Design an enzyme around this catalytic site. Structure first.
Site, PDB file in Angstrom:
ATOM      1  N   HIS D 104      42.231  57.853 -26.674  1.00 20.96           N
ATOM      2  CA  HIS D 104      42.886  58.929 -27.378  1.00 20.96           C
ATOM      3  C   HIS D 104      42.298  60.285 -27.011  1.00 20.96           C
ATOM      4  O   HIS D 104      42.574  61.237 -27.713  1.00 20.96           O
ATOM      5  CB  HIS D 104      42.829  58.808 -28.931  1.00 20.96           C
ATOM      6  CG  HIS D 104      43.222  57.397 -29.298  1.00 20.96           C
ATOM      7  ND1 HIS D 104      42.325  56.348 -29.287  1.00 20.96           N
ATOM      8  CD2 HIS D 104      44.417  56.862 -29.621  1.00 20.96           C
ATOM      9  CE1 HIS D 104      42.948  55.225 -29.604  1.00 20.96           C
ATOM     10  NE2 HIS D 104      44.221  55.503 -29.798  1.00 20.96           N
ATOM     11  N   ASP D 205       2.612  34.412 -12.833  1.00 22.59           N
ATOM     12  CA  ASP D 205       2.642  33.215 -11.974  1.00 22.59           C
ATOM     13  C   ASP D 205       2.213  33.478 -10.546  1.00 22.59           C
ATOM     14  O   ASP D 205       3.101  33.591  -9.691  1.00 22.59           O
ATOM     15  CB  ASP D 205       4.036  32.581 -12.038  1.00 22.59           C
ATOM     16  CG  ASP D 205       4.065  31.192 -11.401  1.00 22.59           C
ATOM     17  OD1 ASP D 205       3.176  30.825 -10.598  1.00 22.59           O
ATOM     18  OD2 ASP D 205       5.047  30.480 -11.714  1.00 22.59           O
ATOM     19  N   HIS D 208       2.635  29.706  -8.106  1.00 26.25           N
ATOM     20  CA  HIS D 208       3.785  29.176  -7.383  1.00 26.25           C
ATOM     21  C   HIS D 208       3.974  29.724  -5.987  1.00 26.25           C
ATOM     22  O   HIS D 208       4.724  29.144  -5.199  1.00 26.25           O
ATOM     23  CB  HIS D 208       5.063  29.482  -8.198  1.00 26.25           C
ATOM     24  CG  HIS D 208       5.674  30.833  -8.006  1.00 26.25           C
ATOM     25  ND1 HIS D 208       5.068  31.977  -8.482  1.00 26.25           N
ATOM     26  CD2 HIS D 208       6.815  31.241  -7.405  1.00 26.25           C
ATOM     27  CE1 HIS D 208       5.828  33.013  -8.191  1.00 26.25           C
ATOM     28  NE2 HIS D 208       6.902  32.606  -7.539  1.00 26.25           N
ATOM     29  N   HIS D 213       7.011  29.927  -2.146  1.00 24.80           N
ATOM     30  CA  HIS D 213       7.266  30.862  -1.046  1.00 24.80           C
ATOM     31  C   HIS D 213       6.644  30.516   0.294  1.00 24.80           C
ATOM     32  O   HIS D 213       6.617  31.361   1.227  1.00 24.80           O
ATOM     33  CB  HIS D 213       6.803  32.280  -1.472  1.00 24.80           C
ATOM     34  CG  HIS D 213       7.618  32.777  -2.634  1.00 24.80           C
ATOM     35  ND1 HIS D 213       8.996  32.956  -2.511  1.00 24.80           N
ATOM     36  CD2 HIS D 213       7.267  33.118  -3.899  1.00 24.80           C
ATOM     37  CE1 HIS D 213       9.436  33.387  -3.683  1.00 24.80           C
ATOM     38  NE2 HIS D 213       8.441  33.505  -4.534  1.00 24.80           N
ATOM     39  N   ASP D 362      13.341  31.583  -5.344  1.00 27.63           N
ATOM     40  CA  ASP D 362      13.019  31.322  -6.754  1.00 27.63           C
ATOM     41  C   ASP D 362      14.220  30.867  -7.584  1.00 27.63           C
ATOM     42  O   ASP D 362      14.066  30.460  -8.735  1.00 27.63           O
ATOM     43  CB  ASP D 362      12.512  32.644  -7.374  1.00 27.63           C
ATOM     44  CG  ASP D 362      11.023  32.847  -7.121  1.00 27.63           C
ATOM     45  OD1 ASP D 362      10.250  31.889  -7.354  1.00 27.63           O
ATOM     46  OD2 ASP D 362      10.675  33.975  -6.713  1.00 27.63           O
TER      47      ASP D 362
HETATM   48  S1  FES Z   1      39.490  58.290 -28.647  1.00 27.31           S
HETATM   49 FE1  FES Z   1      40.314  56.469 -29.643  1.00 27.31          FE
HETATM   50  S2  FES Z   1      38.968  54.676 -28.979  1.00 27.31           S
HETATM   51 FE2  FES Z   1      38.056  56.532 -28.035  1.00 27.31          FE
HETATM   52 FE   LIG Z   2       8.479  33.659  -6.530  1.00 29.12          FE
END
Ligand code: FES
Ligand SMILES: [Fe+3]
Ligand code: FES
Ligand code: FES
Ligand SMILES: [Fe+3]
Ligand SMILES: [Fe+3]
Lengths: 447, 193, 193, 445, 193, 447
Positions: D104, D205, D208, D213, D362
């Site tokens: 709006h 961690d 691991h 890796h 991962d």
């Molecule tokens: S102006 Fe109406 S929902 Fe944003």
């Molecule tokens: Fe890792």
């Protein structure tokens, strides 16, 4: 959530909690209190004109078979086999005298009766009581000038009483025009919005048109073009809004008979509607004959919306709180020239169908308002619908219902959500009645 | 050719179209067809809609996309309108749609959309009667992405007629699509197939 | 050509690229381009990454895939970094990625991945200044499946430059992709587009 | 489930119920007690430097507009129109003085204020009180050397106090280096894991790395290459682990300034860090200057993680219990040469971005540990975080916080899940503070 | 060629197939192959299965689609049946499947199904020993839509052998597919790939 | 819902509430009272014959590693690392002595023990008690003639007792034939149906065949061809139905040894089964030797089904109330010619696999009956299973269990759902036993 106590909708319908567009639990509660209780659009005489004609329709999330009987009446049945629950019919429309379940071959009539069971005599002998095994029937099926509605609750008010004051505004086009026909098949598209987002938009939202539809107004050169981008405001006395006891309401834009159609169709439509208006002045008076050729943006509670004159007819079929399957038909006056009917039907789909350039402007509005209702910081926020509040009247000498005498407002939102809150916090129609005994007083309160 | 009494799933319309291409598969025509479709898709993909309208679309165009109601394979009595038009546009109707796309108050086009088109299975055959008219059939996968995580993929067979206009430029004069999914799961069908 | 003041949705870069192919659509170049992309996709699909590096990729390659930040269609003031590089690799960076794919302790490659690539819309045009350099544009749909029920499908337009090296073998010297979905929904983008 | 009484995390953070990575109802409860209550990463000064500059960001599942005001301050607002709840902004960044809702046309300022309403005078007359219709604002917005965090709960502790002992470890690189800048736009990918999987992985961690890796370590020849496939263990005294009251914590790997970057970038980075460390010895002493150029793997509670020196900066945005949208940025020291910033940023994305060859190792770890939290027979199982327990200290003379004095361990998991369990079973910050009055004693037990 | 001791992810079977096409890329063969697959895809898409059987499939055909069990990349001991056959059909077995598709009591074909096929990456090479036998490789994306909102997309690489029969008509004599997704997420694999 | 009180299955199993196929909360309660409590199919000796051989299998929604030990026994373990919960094994089958988690490298033996932890001495020192950190083990693993079932509940009845009266019918083919082997790998497909839809269909539904499979019957020329489209009814004495205490049951179709296999395989199969029958007459008598070469459509409670003689073996792996992952294997007699085994296996997949033309005919039946169970008007509807009720017997001198002496009926549905309702409303095996003390009397009530 305690639905008896929770204030989802404030007094006089001035605001609603944003979670109503996203809460899955409330969605499941609407299935009980909204879609099992209220009148839902099924079809039109024009889609099932002959004996054995049928369509499939949704009623909430349920699916029903809607069939023209041999005596001319219409009966509607769950699309579910009475044996092991398979879907009976998997097409959208056809003609048949019976429906055979493809699982074990049980044969049902068009009248819902269980007429045959494969090898009945050898298998069930005399044990099977076929009279108790007809298809589950929709208790209430009624017509409004050929528009067929259904309701699963036998205690619902007659459809005409349910339309309340809105029927007065619809009757010039639905009835005194000679009657409408619905043009099928509908366009069908799924949007990621709550069913209430489009329902509220069509019931009462003239405010959004110039801003949301600025590009569609400017590209198409329809009669409201000069509103594009909020460049102008509709003049004093450009229209009105109304709402009614059971939730339906609409906006009226005086004289806008070509509605959203582009310049290519304007002149023929305006000539056709002006000529019929001239004849209706004598049958129903100047005011009603002018309502006939005035653009109505209406929602028939809960989820059936339309634009008379533009000829858009919508069903917002609920899938879950952020999913809705949109069905779009065209409505045309039966005595228009066939070529004009076809062009108007194409034009309805061009503007509001699956590739509708106006309807597509609304997608982000509907979908994000709906999805924001799931967000933690917005669940408890208030969506506002107070524009015009304090100026609505009831009991006017000319225009019935709760009426706001200006084209842009939120009267119709308030009446839609007042009826919604009364349903959601009631167990049955009697309780709705008790909760609605001061409906027009609550809505015109400060006035 | 197709015997549609024996090939019971084939429509009369599909049997006619295949008859047109199963004969003449001329190499120069194929390459022309492929070039026309690839350039048309490129223009559309970069959202050059005015250029698409000027260079690829004929002034007599019929641009049609239908959605066909689902009916029993054995249905013989029910004969009401079978299909609705998602698109059924003339040149001016396309121009309104192009203006709506390029208008700066078209809020749904910010952030800019991303389009990628995949055109395959190109078949071309000259019309028997109108020697300036080329029938081109092709299939498209259209990927539209927007606003972070909205992703919509469209699939379809396109039955086109392309005609030499002035300049010797072959332009689109008819596109026909029978959209294969009855219920759209792409939010809308607002893309040019 | 594209007038980007009238065709308001088109970028300057996209208008440049289409200018290069709308002119020259030489048949021999098209066939060469199609063969190059089909064989490159074949090698990649059967996971022959060393052979891909050896036979299709130039030593001066720039292999780049970007992800561009979503900005207002009317934005004119904000000008910070517009895109990040998902890939931006030289030959040696590609070699590290190929070693990582073939290492037996790459736990994510067991059970073996399945790749299927669909290359369409091939366009080819010789560069004006460097007569050994061919511009090839194509679109790709890449399907990756693994571990029973994991399925990821990638979609993109590829702007390539392919150059004759020694042997007369045309090899990839630049690939540029502007990945169309801003938020990936495929778990990662660890595939070669 | 009763979150006052359900033991999701055991005493001292030694184990957690596997359902915490899969239960949707606990995910909805985390929105209230984790994401509406704690500090969450929003942006950096380097991404909204000028008046009007804005980005959108997630805070939990909510989406906010974070805008630089004309006075140089930063305000953040819910990205939701006050009228009928449409999303106000649909881009990730830009520059504007106001935001107009395309439904709006309501016009809001950059300062959140409802400034205009189409045809106000003819439609609302004098009835609309615009002063009460500003955008819902994030109550608290504070900076940590340019890094901007927000929190919806006005009672939260100040951001510095919420960092508690972790700030000490971060300050050498965030403050005494001259300051960092965040390089945008971030790579964005959705993984099918809970937001706690990667958060716990980054917070503590180091275990691991050599196994998960192994292939990325062997292919790229980065400084930890010799760990590939568990061929070696980091030497005695290779690093440390710490955790703090409000949950943040990290591991330290002494001296690894080129972090995960491959061999092409190692020499320049190592030279750049060695030179700055030499100047910082005089400003902040040997220990703090050495923390500057040591690799920190940190998680700032709940869901922001980083690797200093590698320059990886992550946000684990929650979507649902098994879905997380991962945002990856690069962090780079402002005084590096621009060409070295660019190459470092591309390198961050090459190893840990959307097509990161390390981060991709991962995925199965995170996704299947998360999805297994939904499976019937694993809901009530215990995920273990007891490595190093019994050896942590508090109150050390050199290193503050609950610290474990070795590179590989689970000290930071235990602090992370102790703070997680005190929030989940508390209704507000006062009850968290009452449940955390013996936090360091419970962890060093 | 592929060195599968260095290119460790490549199977021996995939290495062999690429060797056959990386050499001979004859232009007339490519166009013949492309035409064959486009027409075959066309017949299948309009559901002319009898015509497909009559014009595209040889009487000695082996029509085979496998699903391969997921095993460790490093597996060397477990050697039980590696794959099951989703299809493994002779001509008569195809005929029973075509009858089943056209039978009016095939309830799942009402409302009619919609099929669109996208054929790409076509490669063709004559067999060394049998000069009437053409090896054609191509990738397919098959979209199947039905009953309003059921949508199933299938992705695969096809290894075909096409042979000249009587009339000089090249017909399918072998199709081999190794279906890339182990667990099907399309309700079934009841489509002809 | 309260599941002690919630009555989902009426007395004598005559009808079930349609929400049992769609309710997500009941699905989660089935995980506790169905899948954590009962015996679930894992694998066969033929798929893990050697030491170290293993497969992964589902048990409900859990995933387990099923491994042949060095001593020849079989153990099964949750496929979940004891440390931070990663999935341990990501392949379907192989051979190994141990499984290493690729997250932090913990190494587990084939016997489930935690054997190694990277850098244990330097990191954990003496603190880690590896003996308490073995993989969570399936408590109960038993064999039925090479077919290996698992159960998480240590109180369950022995597998033979749980088969109850159904074991008598299975034994001619499973044991007295010399034994079956399972042919892998299985086809794997996901359907949008509840796991109970196929389980019910295979346990007891001969009624659907002629109608649902009309086109498959008519295209392939199998021994049931004449049933196509309900043209004929199976003759008096064509077959029988049975059910048992713990829910397993089956239909018997006398002499139908080639089952669904098309004309190409019929003659070889009929010759092979007739010859074996002739030798079995002497070992087990005429009746049991005829059961051997008679087609059995069986469901082993809850979710393992099979067709003997057709050689179809299915697992309906539950994912959620409308999603099931279907695994299809072939079962062949070990002494058949290898070339026959191969052709029979391909023929199993041809008819009932992922592209099975018969299995495909069932999809819409299963998926829509399952999905309708979520629809509002159908949740509280009754699925009927009363065909033949009042004619079942118990204690017959020839055929044990609750037996209906005709080929087409719903006896096996009743016994399946009676056991289902006794599990769902019980907390443990003792309570199921208390609720099933009059199981055969309730099922034969009006006989
Ligand atoms: S102006 Fe109406 S929902 Fe944003
Ligand atoms: Fe890792
Ligand atoms: S489910 Fe309809 S006849 Fe059995
Ligand atoms: S999750 Fe398995 S070793 Fe850590
Ligand atoms: Fe609108
Ligand atoms: Fe069946």
């Amino acid at each position: 959530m305690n639905y008896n106590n929770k204030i989802l909708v404030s007094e006089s319908g001035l605001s609603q909690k944003h979670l109503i567009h996203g809460d899955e639990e409330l969605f499941q509660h609407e299935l009980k209190t909204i879609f099992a209780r209220n009148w839902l659009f099924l079809t039109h005489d024009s889609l099932i004109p002959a004996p054995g004609d049928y369509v499939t329709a949704k009623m909430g999330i349920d699916e029903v078979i809607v069939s023209r009987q041999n005596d001319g009446s219409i009966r509607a049945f769950l699309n579910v086999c009475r044996h092991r629950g398979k879907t009976l019919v998997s097409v959208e429309a056809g003609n048949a005298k019976g429906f055979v379940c493809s699982y074990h071959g049980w044969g049902f009539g068009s009248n819902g009766e269980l007429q045959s069971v494969p090898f009945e005599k050898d298998l069930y002998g005399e044990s099977l009581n076929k009279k108790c095994l007809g298809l589950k029937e929709v208790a209430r099926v009624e017509s409004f000038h050929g528009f067929i509605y259904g309701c699963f609750d036998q205690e619902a008010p007659p459809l005409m009483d349910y339309l309340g004051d809105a029927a007065w505004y619809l009757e010039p086009m639905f009835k005194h025009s000679g009657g409408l026909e619905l043009v099928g098949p509908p366009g069908k598209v799924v949007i990621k919005a709550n069913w209430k987002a489009p329902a509220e938009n069509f019931v009462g939202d003239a405010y959004h048109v110039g801003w949301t539809h600025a590009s569609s107004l400017r590209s198409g050169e329809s009669i409201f073009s000069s509103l594009a981008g909020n460049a102008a405001l509709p003049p004093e006395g450009a229209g009105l809004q109304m709402t009614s006891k059971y939730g339906s309401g609409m906006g009226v834009l005086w004289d806008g008979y070509s509605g959203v159609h582009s310049a290519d169709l304007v002149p023929e439509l305006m000539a056709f509607g002006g000529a019929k208006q001239e004849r209706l002045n004598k049958e129903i008076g100047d005011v009603r004959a002018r309502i006939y050729r005035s653009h109505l943006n209406c929602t028939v509670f809960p989820n059936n919306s339309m634009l008379t004159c533009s000829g858009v007819f919508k069903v917002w079929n609920p899938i879950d709180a952020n999913t809705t399957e949109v069905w779009t038909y065209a409505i045309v006056e039966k005595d228009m020239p066939e070529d004009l009917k076809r062009r108007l039907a194409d034009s309805v789909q061009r503007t509001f169908g699956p590739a509708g350039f106006w309807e597509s402007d609304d997608n982000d509005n509907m979908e994000t308002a709906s999805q924001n209702g799931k967000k933690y910081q917005s669940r408890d926020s208030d969506l506002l619908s107070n524009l015009g509040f304090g100026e609505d009247v009831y009991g006017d000498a000319v225009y019935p219902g709760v009426v706001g005498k200006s084209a842009i407002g939120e009267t119709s939102y308030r009446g839609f959500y007042r009826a919604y809150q009364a349903h959601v916090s009631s167990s049955n129609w009697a309780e709705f009645e008790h909760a609605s005994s001061t409906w027009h007083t609550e809505l015109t309160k400060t006035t | 050719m197709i015997n549609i009494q024996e090939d019971k799933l084939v429509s009369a319309h599909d049997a006619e179209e295949i008859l047109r291409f199963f004969n003449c598969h001329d190499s120069a025509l194929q390459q022309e067809a492929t070039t026309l479709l690839t350039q048309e898709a490129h223009l559309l993909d970069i959202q050059a809609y005015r250029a698409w309208l000027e260079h690829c679309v004929g002034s007599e165009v019929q641009y049609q996309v239908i959605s066909r109601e689902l009916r029993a394979a054995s249905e013989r009595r029910y004969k009401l309108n079978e299909a609705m038009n998602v698109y059924n546009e003339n040149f001016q109707q396309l121009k309104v749609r192009v203006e709506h796309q390029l208008d700066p108050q078209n809020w749904g086009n910010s952030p800019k959309l991303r389009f990628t088109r995949f055109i395959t299975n190109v078949q071309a055959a000259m019309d028997v009667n109108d020697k300036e008219l080329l029938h081109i059939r092709s299939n498209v996968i259209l990927h539209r992405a927007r606003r972070g995580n909205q992703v919509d993929v469209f699939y379809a067979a396109r039955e086109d007629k392309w005609k030499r206009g002035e300049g010797g430029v072959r332009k689109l004069v008819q596109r026909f699509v029978d959209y294969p999914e009855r219920i759209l799961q792409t939010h809308n069908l607002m893309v040019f197939l």
